[PDB]
Design a protein around this ligand. Structure first.
Ligand SMILES: O=C(O)[C@@](O)(COP(=O)(O)O)[C@H](O)[C@H](O)COP(=O)(O)O
Ligand SMILES: O=C(O)[C@@](O)(COP(=O)(O)O)[C@H](O)[C@H](O)COP(=O)(O)O
Ligand SMILES: [Mg+2]
Ligand SMILES: [Mg+2]
Lengths: 448, 449
C-alpha cells in the first residue's frame, strides 16, 4: 500500500486490453477540461464508474482490482471505449447499470462534457432480463392486423377535457379508422379528468367503436402516477375493464417502477406502451448526455411493447440515420455495428422479443410516404393534431390518415417508388376519399 | 372551429398575465432555433407542456382553454417565465410535474436548447406532498448528535470487496470517529457482494463500533434495485436488522419507486439517505437540462432525509453561490428569490420538514474550513478516499477528519475567521493529533479548481 493521489490513467487506461464476450462495453464522447489529456479523462470515467476514487486506498489490497476494474481500452479522437467486467453488474437491473455507467462521471471537474453514445450489452448479461411482455408478432396476432403500419393518435387538447368529452374524441378517432388512441403523457389523474372516470368512459367508447367498425381497437390508458403502488392500482382497473393496453412514461416514472409494471403487464396479459417523456432533457445535445439508442436498448431489456422513436420529419428533432439504427435495435435479432448510424457495437439480442417503434409528433398525411420509407410495416404512426385538426374533426381525420397509410402500403407492395411518386400516390387515393383530399389541402404548407 | 396551424404565441404568450398564488411557475432559459423569435419559442414551450399541439383541433372547443392553458407571462432576455394553473397537476405526484414540465418540450426543432432553471411550487400544491420522513431535527435526536456537521464516508473500492472485508472497512471507519458510512451508489447486489450478506455483516460492524465508542452510529445500506418490490424487500431486511438508515439512488431508481420507498421509510421508522446518481447527466450544462435546484425541490417534496448537494471545492463540479441557495431550499421554511444565486422565485415550504445537505466527493482535511463556511452545522461531510487513503488506513483517517471538523467548528464558535485562519486552525490541531498531521501532509498539493 502506497498512500497518495495517482493519475487515473495508471490503473484505468489499458489500450492493450482485449474485450471479452462477457464484458459490457461503453462508447463515451469526452470533452476534457482544457489541459487534461484524453487518456486521463477517459481513465477518470472508467475509474469512477467501476472501482476507483480520487486517491489510493488501503482497502484496494483487500480485493483483486485487476479482476473488477473497468478499463478504457481504446481512444479514437474524443471517443473512449471502456470495458466493464460482467461481475460488476446486478442481474436484471437497468437501475444498477445506470448507477455505475452514468452515476457520477458526468459531473467531474476534469471532464467538462460527457456523452454516452452506445453500450454493448453482453449476451451473458442480457439473459438476466425478460424483454417485452408481448412482442411485435404476438401483438399483431392479438390485434389481427398485418401487413401495414398501425395507426394511432394522442387525444387533444393534452389536458382540460372532461372524461365524457375525452371519450367522445376517442370514439370519433377509433370509429374513423385509427387502430388505437392514447392519453397524453401528462394526462394522469387531475381535477378536470380523474383516472377512474377516464378509464371507464374510454373503454365504453373503445367497445362501441370495435362493435361498429368490426375491427379490434385499443386505447393506451396512462397508468403513470406518483408511486409504484398507485400505478399498479390503475393497471388493475384497466385489466378489469378489458383494456388490451396500458401506458407508462418509463423515464418520468423511472426504471424501478417501470420494471414493476412490466412484470404486472406480462402476468395480466396486457400490452405495454412506453412513452419516452423527459428523454430530450438528456439525449438532445451531441456533447453531453445519453443518446437515445442507449435508452432504447435499456427499454427493450426491461420490456416495453412499443416505444416512441421520433418521426425524423415531424415537430420534434430526430436524425434519419440514427433513427434507422434505433429501429433495428428495437426490432432485429442482431444488429451489426454501423458508424454511419452511431452504432458503435455489434448487438446480439439473445432471443429477446422485439419492440414496435412509434413515430409521433407533428405528422400529417403528406409525411406518410416518408414514414413508410423510413420504418416499413412494423411501426405505429400516431396522428394527434393530424387527426383532430382535420377540417371536419377527428373521425374524418382518422379516415384520411388510415387511407393514406394503406394507399402508400399498396404502392410499395406493387414495387412503386413511394418517395419519388409520393404525392401522386396520395392524389390517386384522394380521388375516392374526400377526407384525404381535405387533409392534403389544409396542411400542404406545413413543414418542419 | 378554425382549422389549420396557428403560431403558438397567439394563444400561449400573454405578457399581461399576473400570476396567482395557486399557479405553478417555471423559469426556462430558451435558445430558439435561429429565426424563431423568443416569443414564439417560449409560447411553444408553454403550449406543449400544458394543453396545446401543433395545429388547431376541433376538441379545443369542448373545454375552456383559457382556464387550463399555461401562459408565458414575462420574458427577460433568454429567460421565459411560464405560469401553469393549479388544476393542471396531479396531487402529490412529482412524476406528473415532470411529465408536463419536462416531458416533450426539450426536443422540439424550434427550440434548439432549453434549461429549466427554477420552479415556484405553490403552497396549495405543496400541501399534497408529505416531505421528508424524518427531518433534520428528529434525525439529530435519533443520533443524539448536536452542534456540528455530521461525519460520513463512502466505502472504497466502489466494488469488489467481499461482504466480510466490506464490513471490516466499515468498522474501522466508525470506530475511528465517523458518525456514518455508506454503500457506493453502484453497490447494490453483485456476485462479489450480495445484498443480504452485506446487510448482515455491516450491521454487526455498526453495533460493535457503537458499543466500543459509546456514540450512536449508522450505515447507509443501499436498497437501490431493479424493481420497486426488490427495493422494499431489501428495506424490510434493513429494518429487521435494526438499521437506522436505508439509502436509495432516487434518480436512477426513479421518482415513482422513490415515493414508494419514502412511504415505507416513514411507516417503518427508518431514515432515508438519497443519492443523486445520474443528476449531472442533465444538470451539468448551462444551456440545456434541469438545474439541480429543481431536483432538490422535488426531492424535499417526495421526502428524503438527506440529499447530496456537491462540495464546490472537491472533485465534482458545483458553484458556491448556487450551492448556498440549494442548501437554503433544502433547510429553510421560506426562501426569498435571489437572482445572484439562481433562485428565480420565492419558495414557501408550507411547513414541510427540512433535508440534510450532504457534501461528498474528493474532499480532505484541507477542505474542512471551506466546507464549514459554506454549509454551517446542518450538513453531512463525507470522506471516502479522504478516510481510507490515510497513510495508516481508515481508522486513522476517520480520526483526522473528525478532529479537523471539530477544530474548525471550535474556532468558528471562537469568533475566528475560519477562511482566513483556516490553515492555522488545522495546524494547531495537527500538533495534538498525529493522524491529522499525516493527512494534511499527504494531500497538501491536491487541489481542484
Ligand atoms: O404530446 C405530444 O406532442 C404527442 O402527443 C404528439 O401529439 P401530436 O400528435 O398532436 O403532435 C406525443 O406525446 C409526442 O409526439 C411525443 O414525442 P416523441 O414521440 O418524440 O417522444
Ligand atoms: O462515488 C463517489 O465518488 C462518492 O462515493 C465519493 O467518493 P470519495 O468520498 O472517495 O470522493 C460519492 O458518491 C460522490 O461524492 C457523489 O457525488 P455527489 O456527492 O456530487 O452526488
Ligand atoms: Mg403527448
Ligand atoms: Mg459513491
Amino acid at each position: 500500500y502506497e498512500a497518495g493521489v495517482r493519475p487515473y490513467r495508471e490503473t484505468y487506461y489499458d489500450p492493450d486490453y482485449e474485450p471479452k464476450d462477457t464484458d459490457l462495453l461503453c462508447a463515451f464522447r469526452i470533452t476534457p477540461k482544457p489541459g487534461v489529456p484524453m487518456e486521463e479523462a477517459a481513465a477518470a470515467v472508467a475509474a469512477e464508474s467501476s472501482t476507483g476514487t480520487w486517491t489510493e486506498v488501503w482497502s484496494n489490497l483487500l480485493t483483486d482490482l485487476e479482476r473488477y476494474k473497468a478499463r478504457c481500452y481504446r481512444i479514437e479522437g474524443d471517443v473512449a471505449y471502456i470495458a466493464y467486467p460482467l461481475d460488476l453488474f446486478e442481474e436484471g437491473s437497468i437501475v444498477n447499470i445506470m448507477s455505475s455507467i452514468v452515476g457520477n462521471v458526468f459531473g467531474f471537474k476534469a471532464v467538462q462534457a460527457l456523452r454516452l453514445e452506445d453500450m454493448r450489452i453482453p449476451v451473458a448479461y442480457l439473459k438476466t432480463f425478460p424483454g417485452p411482455p408481448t412482442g411485435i408478432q404476438v401483438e399483431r396476432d392479438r390485434l389481427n392486423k398485418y401487413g401495414r403500419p398501425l395507426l394511432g393518435g394522442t387525444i387533444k387538447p393534452k389536458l382540460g377535457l372532461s372524461a365524457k368529452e375525452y371519450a367522445r374524441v376517442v370514439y370519433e378517432c377509433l370509429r374513423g379508422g385509427l387502430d388505437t388512441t392514447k392519453d397524453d403523457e401528462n394526462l394522469n389523474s387531475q381535477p378536470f379528468n380523474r383516472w377512474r372516470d377516464r378509464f371507464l368512459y374510454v373503454m365504453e367508447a373503445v367497445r362501441k367503436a370495435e362493435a361498429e367498425t368490426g375491427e379490434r381497437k385499443g386505447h393506451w390508458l396512462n397508468v403513470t402516477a406518483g408511486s409504484t403502488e398507485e400505478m399498479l392500482k390503475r393497471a388493475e382497473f384497466a385489466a378489469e375493464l378489458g383494456s388490451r393496453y396500458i401506458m407508462v412514461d418509463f423515464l418520468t416514472a423511472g426504471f424501478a417502477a417501470f420494471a414493476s409494471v412490466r412484470r404486472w403487464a406480462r402476468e395480466n396479459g396486457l400490452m405495454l406502451h412506453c412513452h419516452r417523456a423527459m428523454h430530450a432533457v438528456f439525449d438532445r445535445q451531441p456533447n453531453h448526455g445519453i443518446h437515445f439508442r442507449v435508452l432504447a436498448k435499456w427499454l427493450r431489456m426491461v420490456g416495453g411493447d412499443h416505444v416512441h422513436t421520433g418521426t425524423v420529419v415531424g415537430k420534434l428533432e430526430g436524425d434519419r440515420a440514427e433513427t434507422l439504427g434505433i429501429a433495428d435495435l428495437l426490432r432485429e435479432d442482431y444488429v451489426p455495428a454501423d458508424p454511419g448510424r452511431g452504432l458503435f457495437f455489434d448487438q446480439d439480442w439473445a432471443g429477446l422479443k422485439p419492440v414496435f417503434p412509434v413515430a409521433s409528433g407533428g405528422i400529417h398525411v403528406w409525411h406518410v410516404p416518408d414514414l413508410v420509407s423510413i420504418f416499413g410495416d412494423d411501426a405505429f404512426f400516431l396522428f394527434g393534431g393530424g387527426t383532430h385538426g382535420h377540417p371536419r374533426g377527428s373521425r374524418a381525420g382518422a379516415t384520411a390518415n388510415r387511407v393514406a397509410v394503406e394507399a402508400v402500403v399498396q404502392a410499395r407492395n406493387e414495387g412503386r417508388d413511394i418517395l419519388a411518386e409520393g404525392r401522386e400516390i396520395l392524389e390517386e387515393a384522394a380521388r375516392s376519399c374526400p377526407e384525404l383530399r381535405e387533409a392534403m389541402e389544409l396542411w400542404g404548407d406545413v413543414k418542419f
